[PDB]
Amino acid sequence: KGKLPPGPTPLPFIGNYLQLNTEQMYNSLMKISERYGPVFTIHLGPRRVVVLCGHDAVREALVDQAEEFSGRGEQATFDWVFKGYGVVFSNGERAKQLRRFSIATLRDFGVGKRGIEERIQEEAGFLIDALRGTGGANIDPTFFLSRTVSNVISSIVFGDRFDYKDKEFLSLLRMMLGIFQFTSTSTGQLYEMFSSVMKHLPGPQQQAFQLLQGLEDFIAKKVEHNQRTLDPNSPRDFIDSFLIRMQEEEKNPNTEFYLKNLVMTTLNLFIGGTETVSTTLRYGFLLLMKHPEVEAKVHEEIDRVIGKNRQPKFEDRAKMPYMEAVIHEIQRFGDVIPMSLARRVKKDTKFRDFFLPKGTEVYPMLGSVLRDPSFFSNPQDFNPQHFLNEKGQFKKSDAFVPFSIGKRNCFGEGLARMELFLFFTTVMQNFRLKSSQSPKDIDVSPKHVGFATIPRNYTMSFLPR
Ligand code: HEM
Numbered sequence: 001k002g003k004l005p006p007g008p009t010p011l012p013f014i015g016n017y018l019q020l021n022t023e024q025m026y027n028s029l030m031k032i033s034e035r036y037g038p039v040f041t042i043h044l045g046p047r048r049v050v051v052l053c054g055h056d057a058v059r060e061a062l063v064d065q066a067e068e069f070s071g072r073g074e075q076a077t078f079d080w081v082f083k084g085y086g087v088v089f090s091n092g093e094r095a096k097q098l099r100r101f102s103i104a105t106l107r108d109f110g111v112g113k114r115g116i117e118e119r120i121q122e123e124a125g126f127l128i129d130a131l132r133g134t135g136g137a138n139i140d141p142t143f144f145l146s147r148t149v150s151n152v153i154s155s156i157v158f159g160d161r162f163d164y165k166d167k168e169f170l171s172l173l174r175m176m177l178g179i180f181q182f183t184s185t186s187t188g189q190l191y192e193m194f195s196s197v198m199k200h201l202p203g204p205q206q207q208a209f210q211l212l213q214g215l216e217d218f219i220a221k222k223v224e225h226n227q228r229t230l231d232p233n234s235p236r237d238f239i240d241s242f243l244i245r246m247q248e249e250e251k252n253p254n255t256e257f258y259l260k261n262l263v264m265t266t267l268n269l270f271i272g273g274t275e276t277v278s279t280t281l282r283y284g285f286l287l288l289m290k291h292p293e294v295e296a297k298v299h300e301e302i303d304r305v306i307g308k309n310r311q312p313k314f315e316d317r318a319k320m321p322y323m324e325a326v327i328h329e330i331q332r333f334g335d336v337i338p339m340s341l342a343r344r345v346k347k348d349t350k351f352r353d354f355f356l357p358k359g360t361e362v363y364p365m366l367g368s369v370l371r372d373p374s375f376f377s378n379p380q381d382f383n384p385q386h387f388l389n390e391k392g393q394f395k396k397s398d399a400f401v402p403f404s405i406g407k408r409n410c411f412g413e414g415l416a417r418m419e420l421f422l423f424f425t426t427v428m429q430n431f432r433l434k435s436s437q438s439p440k441d442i443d444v445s446p447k448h449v450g451f452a453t454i455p456r457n458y459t460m461s462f463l464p465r
């Protein structure tokens with residue numbers, strides 16, 4: 001054919017706005033795919049975007065033509081602060097250099113190794129102490145979980161953890177929660193279409209911008225402290241490593257290693273390394289309270305494999321198929337980043353006999369893959385059996401793509417999975433979950449869905465086992 005994928009005809013500037021509901025973008029786009037097919041073009045305001053729905057379309061593009069679909073598209077709210085700098089919301093040689101350096105440096109600091117496993121175990125112990133500190137009282141788990149998650153990546157990028165009583169630490173966590181909520185609301189999705197105008201108007205978007213600025217300013221302050229105390233022969237953390245590479249590159253006019261990329265890359269890892277794991281844990285405990293039979297089976301396996309005295313270790317997962325299946329089902333059901341981070345085609349591309357001109361933005365609808373009816377028998381239900389065969393052994397799925405796939409896939413995936421396993425296991429080993437309502441009345445449908453999937457606010461209690 002040689003034409004862009006079919007789609008509803010757009011109007012000048014507003015694009016397909018009148019055929020979308022900003023409060024429910026995913027549903028709006030899926031409604032349209034019913035009429036046009038799994039691969040279709042939509043106009044988010046002036047942004048022309050090819051939407052990919054279901055497993056086959058997403059994998060054929062992001063993996064079978066991995067290089068062609070390896071550009072990074074926009075996320076207007078985050079782009080407001082990043083401006084194309086840093087490792088996530090960037091492209092070309094910049095993204096390439098920063099990703100290579102970030103992955104290597106994360107490994108140097110223990111990611112994927114015993115060093116970060118010990119760090120996570122230690123922080124998990126501090127979370128158990130905090131939960132015991134509640135005395136079994138009903139509490140909002142939100143910041144108990146995010147403080148613990150954030151301290152892992154914070155130890156790597158800043159060199160040490162934050163005290164749980166640190167007010168400024170709580171402030172930063174509130175900024176992250178607030179920005180993820182904003183991008184998941186109707187105004188946040190309206191902003192993705194009309195940022196050209198909205199960035200200049202009063203409204204919730206200015207408050208989101210100030211939370212991003214608060215975070216950037218905190219990182220800039222940390223980088224400054226590190227600079228005036230730097231030992232080039234003994235780096236303390238990610239920031240020092242990057243500062244050293246910046247010194248070595250000082251005579252290269254075209255280097256990507258300079259201050260703005262240091263601040264933006266560190267900001268990416270601090271926010272990226274905190275919020276999505278935190279949201280996943282929060283959604284996981286809510287699902288476990290909705291499904292007591294699953295919490296019971298989790299407890300049987302933990303008690304049998306690990307017992308009640310020692311701390312869970314990452315190698316325990318190999319002996320724990322039920323917990324592995326439960327964590328996968330929490331990520332599958334939770335669908336925390338439902339439309340991934342947008343990609344962009346690097347060059348003119350032929351895809352399924354459609355034509356995608358260079359620069360065209362792409363929305364890999366991960367949630368549509370996590371719920372693809374060809375891969376999960378009851379995609380709308382929370383059921384760990386989706387990841388187990390008949391003998392209760394763990395069964396992988398090609399449609400398990402919460403970290404996306406391809407050339408710009410999540411490189412925090414290893415750290416995230418180690419955290420999820422160790423925090424869910426260590427919490428469940430030590431506590432049984434007590435809801436403020438009967439399982440039948442617990443609502444696990446999301447509070448907001450846009451850039452992220454945010455669970456409804458709730459309280460619960462952790463009772464020692
Ligand atoms: C439950 C946890 C997490 C989820 C669901 C998640 C998911 C994702 C997704 C969907 C993407 C976009 C991939 C693409 O464009 O195809 C991404 C990218 C990224 N993630 Fe994560 N992530 C998680 C945890 C982490 C952690 C712990 C870190 C940091 C240590 C992190 C760092 C990044 C970075 C730096 C990118 C950008 C990669 C690039 O542009 O080249 N993520 N993640």
Ligand SMILES: CNCc1ccc(-c2cccnc2)o1
Nearest residue numbers: 078088267268271272273276
């Ligand atoms: C968690 N991994 C991918 C992901 C989702 C949202 C973000 C993110 C948001 C703001 C700054 N840096 C990164 O990164």
